[PDB]
Write a protein that binds this ligand. Structure first.
Ligand SMILES: Cc1cc2nc3c(=O)[nH]c(=O)nc-3n(C[C@H](O)[C@H](O)[C@H](O)COP(=O)(O)OP(=O)(O)OC[C@H]3O[C@@H](n4cnc5c(N)ncnc54)[C@H](O)[C@@H]3O)c2cc1C
Ligand SMILES: Cn1c(C(=O)Nc2ccccc2COc2ccc(OC[C@@H]3CCNC3)cc2)cc2sccc21
Lengths: 133, 666
């Protein structure tokens, strides 16, 4: 039913080395030349990606910003109220980004802000401005 | 190997069933009730058992009946039929026995036999054993034909047949008892030595051998499963099949490599895309950070919009700094993977050239066994006799195989130096025309009821014909002769004084440099008591080495023999012989092979006897007159001694049934 171990011969590829008297050497030379091909292509991308690595040299350590740990507070000083409005205007609905930019509020605290203040800061209107972007 | 059942096996018969031959002579029984048959087989099997655990003496009907146990006693005619049948078809009372009753006073019927090869001799004895008048005609000055032993002083080497290929079912088992043959086993270890004179590394040897065996299986699968047995409406050789298979491996070696390097570049390109994303994000960062710094530089107090800017810029930056790390993570995974793909590269070659050479030795060994280039063997059929090979070790005949024909030729009318030239057969009888080999002009004429042709297939093939048939042979016969293959294989005998090789090693090989000359002296044999080394010429090489003088050939041997062993240890040889089996005109080659385009069926054609046309038109159907035996008549044992023998025995049966009648079919 099956050829010996590690010997490979499908019906198809027998017939393929039969057609002419040099399908033998033809089929074999195609791959010889198809191989040298893929090897030169490899070399290209080694050099291409080697130059791109040189430009990443330094990582981003120069532009890294110290961590800070803010203890989520429940009250909204006028200060961080105003940060919010501006954050909404810029970030739209990115509740995360807003919670970060303010620093001391959780992502839920931001959510219930939208509703609690929707009235007093016309937040609906504000989002429409961000809409146009 | 136990019981009467063992005698059946030792006589190539199924203990539990009736053969088709037996059906023909005992149609009543095989047609009959189960029980009657079961009886028959025992009577048969038992009788055989008797013959063979003592084949030194005739086994009579009474002697057999003697060892009879009921209900097997009951029927005395049955026992007689059986014993007669067995005796007729040389299953018992063959070879060399002591007779009980000296021969019948008077002979009956006259037969001429062509050739005193084993096939000839076997039948001659049988016929004479059945009291016909028999005369053999040998062109040679000696019996045996392709059994040819060389003798000088204590040097004894076989140039022809040398091996008994197992004893389990072999007739020669029985002959071995009847004649003193010194049967010695063969040690399988065969060390190889490349051109340099340096053994092949044990690791290599094992791999290539294993590859070779796989390459064969390959072809068989290739033949039977993929049905790849025609190409350009020409039948496919074994050599073609191998070439094909090899290429496909060589090809698949490449296919792997390609697929592996393509897996690399697919990843190499995923990385390129990442590295861009990375490099661009680094720029957005550099520049953004700058902005944040500037926004931070604005000393307070400051209104809320300026405050917001710092925060927004601060967050926008830590956000971009997150992305980049996720990417440098992704990068490290792809980067390590790349080096692991690079770590395990699919194999570079299928086989080297130093390999391909060693492989070519294993092929030469195959061309040796079948005595022909693999380009000539039938892919479908070359190994058709593999199912009937005997059991047990292969032995040499140490004292020279010639012992066996010579033994057989005792008390036989043998005209040596009598070359048959023409064979005429008619309804009336036949006449054979020979000549003396020494004075070709001196002419002989023999008349007989029947002729038995044991002419070698090479002779039969000869064109223009060495022997002429009158009338000429039917096209069905001659076509078979054309289709069948008659190979060649040659031995070189080296008689030294000192044993300068390893005596614990029976045989060792030498690896020829090229495919073309893989046959040349590719294998050597210390198999004899004396200090004697044989060297084989096989394959394409055999045919060509038959135009090189003895001296040159021994030159080449000695040279080869100094690589392995060193110019100090290798003396000149005292006596040397080289064979030339294809040039030998009473042979025209070595032995048959199922050539591409033939089948084992042709072997059966060559055994069919020939019946002449009637003398007077509308006269009754004649009796057949011309019969055939030899190594090429026996489908299941071709190209061996035992087959030659068996073919002789067989005809002796066919002939006697014709000319003495069969009193056992009652
Ligand atoms: C090198 C070699 C090694 C072998 N090794 C083995 C082995 O190891 N084991 C094995 O089992 N078998 C072996 N054989 C095969 C074996 O030798 C044959 O199968 C067998 O001996 C053939 O017997 P035969 O009677 O069929 O033909 P032959 O033995 O040739 O007998 C036919 C006879 O006819 C004679 N003759 C030819 N032309 C004429 C003519 N015009 N007129 C009259 N007579 C003629 C011949 O001279 C010959 O004596 C080997 C053969 C060779 C060549
Ligand atoms: C030449 N020869 C030999 C022979 O000299 N063989 C030998 C010599 C030293 C070591 C080992 C071997 C075994 O190697 C084989 C070689 C051939 C073989 O089948 C050959 C027949 C002929 C066609 N079908 C099978 C079996 C074993 C045996 C036989 S039987 C018929 C011919 C022949």
């Amino acid at each position: 039913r099956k050829p010996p171990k590690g010997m490979f011969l499908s019906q198809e590829d027998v017939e393929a080395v039969s057609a002419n008297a040099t399908a033998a050497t033809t089929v074999l030379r195609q791959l010889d030349m198809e191989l040298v091909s893929v090897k030169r292509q490899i070399q290209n991308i080694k050099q291409t990606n080697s130059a791109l690595k040189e430009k990443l040299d330094g990582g981003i350590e120069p532009y890294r910003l110290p961590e800070v740990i803010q203890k989520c507070n429940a009250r909204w000083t006028t200060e961080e109220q105003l940060l919010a409005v501006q954050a909404i205007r810029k970030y739209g609905r990115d509740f995360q980004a807003i919670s970060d930019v303010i620093g001391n509020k959780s992502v839920v605290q931001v959510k219930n802000f939208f509703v609690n203040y929707r009235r007093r800061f016309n937040i609906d209107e504000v989002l429409q401005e961000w809409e146009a972007e | 190997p136990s019981g009467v059942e063992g005698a059946a096996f030792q006589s190539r018969l199924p203990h539990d069933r009736m053969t088709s031959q037996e059906a023909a002579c005992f149609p009543d029984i095989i047609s009959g009730p189960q029980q009657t048959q079961k009886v028959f087989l025992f009577i048969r099997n038992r009788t055989l058992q008797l013959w063979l655990d003592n084949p030194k003496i005739q086994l009579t009907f009474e002697a057999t009946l003697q060892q009879l146990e009921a209900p097997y006693n009951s029927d005395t005619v049955l026992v007689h039929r059986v014993h007669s049948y067995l005796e007729r078809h040389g299953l018992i009372n063959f070879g060399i026995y002591k007779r009980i009753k000296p021969l019948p006073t008077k002979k009956t019927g006259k037969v001429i036999i062509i050739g005193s090869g084993v096939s000839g001799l076997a039948a001659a004895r049988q016929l004479q054993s059945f009291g016909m008048d028999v005369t053999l005609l040998e062109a040679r000055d000696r019996v045996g034909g392709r059994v040819a032993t060389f003798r000088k002083g204590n040097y004894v080497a076989d140039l022809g047949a040398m091996v008994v290929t197992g004893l389990g079912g072999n007739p020669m088992a029985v002959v071995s008892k009847q004649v003193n043959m010194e049967l010695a086993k063969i040690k399988q270890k065969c060390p190889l030595y490349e051109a340099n004179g340096q053994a092949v590394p044990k690791e290599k040897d094992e791999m290539v051998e294993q590859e070779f065996n796989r390459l064969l299986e390959a072809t068989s699968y290739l033949s039977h499963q993929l049905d790849f047995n025609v190409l350009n409406n020409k039948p496919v050789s074994l050599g073609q099949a191998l070439e094909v298979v090899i290429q496909l491996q060589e090809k698949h070696v490449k296919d792997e490599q390609i697929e592996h390097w393509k897996k690399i570049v697919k990843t190499q390109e995923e990385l390129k895309e990442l590295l861009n994303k990375m490099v661009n994000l680094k720029e957005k960062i550099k520049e953004l950070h700058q902005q944040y710094k500037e926004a931070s530089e604005v000393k307070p107090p400051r209104d809320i919009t300026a405050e917001f800017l710092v925060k927004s810029k601060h967050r926008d930056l830590t956000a971009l700094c997150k992305e980049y790390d996720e990417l440098a993570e992704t990068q490290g995974k792809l980067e390590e993977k790349l080096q692991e793909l690079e770590a395990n590269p699919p194999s570079d070659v299928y086989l080297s050239s130093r390999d391909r050479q060693i492989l070519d030795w294993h092929f030469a060994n195959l061309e040796f066994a079948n005595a022909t280039p693999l380009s000539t063997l039938s892919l479908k059929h070359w190994d058709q006799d593999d199912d009937f090979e005997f059991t047990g070790s292969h032995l040499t005949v140490r004292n020279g195989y010639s012992c066996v024909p010579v033994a057989l030729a005792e008390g036989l009318d043998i005209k040596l130096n009598t070359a048959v030239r023409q064979v005429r057969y008619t309804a009336s009888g036949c006449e054979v025309i020979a000549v003396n080999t020494r004075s070709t002009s001196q002419t002989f004429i023999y008349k007989c009821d029947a002729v038995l042709c044991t002419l070698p297939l090479g002779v039969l093939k000869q064109q223009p014909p060495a022997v002429q048939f009158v009338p000429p042979l039917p096209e069905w016969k001659t076509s078979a002769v054309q289709r069948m293959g008659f190979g060649n294989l040659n031995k070189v005998v080296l008689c030294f004084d000192r044993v300068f090789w390893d005596p614990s090693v029976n045989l060792f090989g030498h690896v020829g440099s090229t495919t073309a000359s893989r046959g040349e002296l590719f294998l050597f044999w210390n198999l004899y008591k004396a200090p004697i080394l044989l060297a084989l010429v096989a394959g394409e090489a055999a045919g060509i080495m038959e135009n090189i003088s003895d001296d040159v050939i021994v030159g080449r041997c000695l040279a080869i023999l100094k690589g392995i062993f060193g110019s100090s240890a290798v003396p000149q040889p005292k006596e040397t012989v080289v064979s030339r089996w294809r040039a030998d005109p009473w042979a025209r080659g070595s032995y048959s092979y199922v050539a591409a385009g033939s089948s084992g069926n042709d072997y059966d054609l060559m055994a069919q006897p020939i019946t002449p046309g009637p003398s007077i038109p509308g006269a009754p159907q004649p009796i057949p007159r011309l019969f055939f035996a030899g190594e090429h008549t026996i489908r299941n044992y071709p190209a061996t001694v035992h087959g030659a023998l068996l073919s002789g025995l067989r005809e002796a049966g066919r002939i006697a049934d014709q000319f003495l009648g069969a009193m056992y079919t009652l």
